[PDB]
Write a structure and sequence with these properties.
By secondary structure, the chain is an all-alpha fold. The chain has one domain: Alpha Horseshoe (Serine Threonine Protein Phosphatase 5, Tetratricopeptide repeat). It is built from 12 helices and 2 strands, in the order E-E-H-H-H-H-H-H-H-H-H-H-H-H. Helix 1 packs parallel to helix 3, helix 5 packs antiparallel against helix 6 and helix 6 (101-109) packs parallel to helix 8. The termini are far apart.
Length: 215
């Protein structure tokens, strides 16, 4: 064949497009071409080469919700499950943000680091809180996620849930007894940022919900 799995006759498996910096394996992920991805890996393609934004074929599979290629990639021992994009984003954080539930759990079960963080000190749980991804929050919390971890602005996931108006996820954090007293760098409590951004429902939750025999 003149071309096989995006690779032109006799070219390197690691060659990258000028436009996106993507390799054949990145493209197999985006097109959900399970067979191509399998053949490329058997030919020893590097599953951790980064495109122009630092994404590996695994970030690409998550972004394209390609379950087939995704499975193939996480089953491949050499795949860096915690690969970071140029802003520190990992496949897990990415899965939490896009709300691709099946992948988040599969990543965690494959031992992805639940407490890894992007360049802003944000963990997958911080993000699940920010986008109000309840299911991701529950699974991360059940799997060792640090509920009170502070990012670089000293914001906890709860702080972020308060900031963004993620009512349901702030509730999950409280059901897990997250510390609602930890403030950000401006000394604001999740309650203070919730009031400032007009999420009165969350302010109420913080003042009454699941308190110490005082709720």
């Amino acid at each position: 064949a003149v071309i096989s799995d995006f690779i032109y006759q006799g070219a390197s498996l690691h060659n990258q497009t000028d436009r996106t910096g993507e390799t054949a394996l990145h493209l197999a992920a985006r097109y959900s071409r399970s067979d191509a991805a399998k053949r490329l890996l058997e030919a020893s393609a590097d599953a951790n080469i980064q495109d122009n934004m630092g994404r590996t074929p695994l970030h690409a599979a998550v972004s394209a919700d390609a379950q087939g290629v995704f499975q193939i990639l996480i089953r491949n021992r050499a795949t860096d499950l915690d690969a970071r994009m140029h802003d520190g984003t990992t496949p897990l954080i990415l899965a939490a943000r896009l709300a691709v539930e099946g992948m988040l759990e599969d990543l965690i079960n494959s031992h992805a680091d639940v407490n890894a963080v992007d360049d802003l000190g944000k963990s997958a749980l911080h993000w699940a809180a920010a986008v109000n991804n309840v299911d991701a929050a529950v699974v991360l919390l059940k799997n060792g996620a640090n509920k009170d971890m502070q990012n670089n602005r000293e914001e906890t996931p709860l702080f972020l849930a308060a900031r963004e108006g993620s009512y349901e996820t702030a509730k999950v954090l409280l059901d897990h007894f997250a510390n609602r007293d930890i403030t950000d760098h401006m000394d604001r409590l999740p309650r203070d940022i919730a009031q400032e951004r007009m999420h009165h429902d969350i302010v109420r939750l913080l003042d009454e919900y699941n308190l110490v025999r005082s709720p």
